[PDB]
Write a protein that binds this ligand. Structure first.
Ligand SMILES: [Ca+2]
Length: 202
């Protein structure tokens, strides 16, 4: 198990709060108990509207520290995502509430809601993923189409570029791993040749 009483009671209370929330009844957020102990949770957030993430659903790994509520939960995206403040590789998240701006009054609900707000307002000048952040600044429309394609492929969002989809299917039919292809093509500005050259170096 068991965690300290203050940690247990805070988590039971925030978990109930997420269950009863309007946001969860509108299907915007949810939390799932992974562990009878309350130390491990799985979250889910919906992509905000009018973003490349709209229509997608993003799963999160939430680990609760022994020191809760005085330290933040450890949170990572399980669902792959293309965003300047999230690692395209690990799901690691660059957000101040998860680092130095945590406050003991914050809750599972406000962390999920804050991550959805982050999807709707990236900060590319303090990035987690430099390659994504560069594309966001240097070619906004390419970034938009890449994020949307990742939302479609990994998060179940409806649409993405026909152009992009065809490049992926070309390289996958050429015998490469589908995820390696999405990553190569996304990182190399959708250039089949340097994407392919990167893929041939594995
Ligand atoms: Ca214990």
């Amino acid at each position: 198990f068991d965690m300290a009483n203050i940690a247990v009671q805070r988590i039971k209370r925030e978990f109930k709060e997420v269950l009863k929330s309007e946001e969860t009844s509108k299907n915007q957020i949810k939390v799932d108990l992974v562990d009878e102990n309350f130390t491990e949770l799985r979250g889910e957030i919906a992509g905000p509207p009018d973003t490349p993430y709209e229509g997608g659903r993003y799963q999160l790994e939430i680990k609760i520290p022994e020191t809760y509520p005085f330290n933040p939960p450890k949170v990572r995206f399980i669902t792959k995502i293309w965003h300047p403040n999230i690692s395209s590789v690990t799901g690691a998240i660059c957000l101040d509430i998860l680092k130095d701006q945590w406050a003991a009054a914050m809750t599972l609900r406000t962390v999920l809601l804050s991550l959805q707000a982050l999807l709707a307002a990236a900060e590319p000048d303090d990035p987690q993923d430099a390659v994504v952040a560069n594309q966001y600044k240097q070619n906004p429309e390419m970034f938009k189409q890449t994020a949307r394609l990742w939302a479609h492929v990994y998060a179940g969002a409806p649409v993405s570029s026909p152009e992009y989809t065809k490049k992926i299917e070309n390289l996958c039919a050429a015998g490469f791993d589908r995820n390696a292809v999405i990553v190569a093509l996304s990182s190399k500005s959708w250039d089949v040749e340097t994407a392919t050259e990167l893929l041939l170096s594995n």
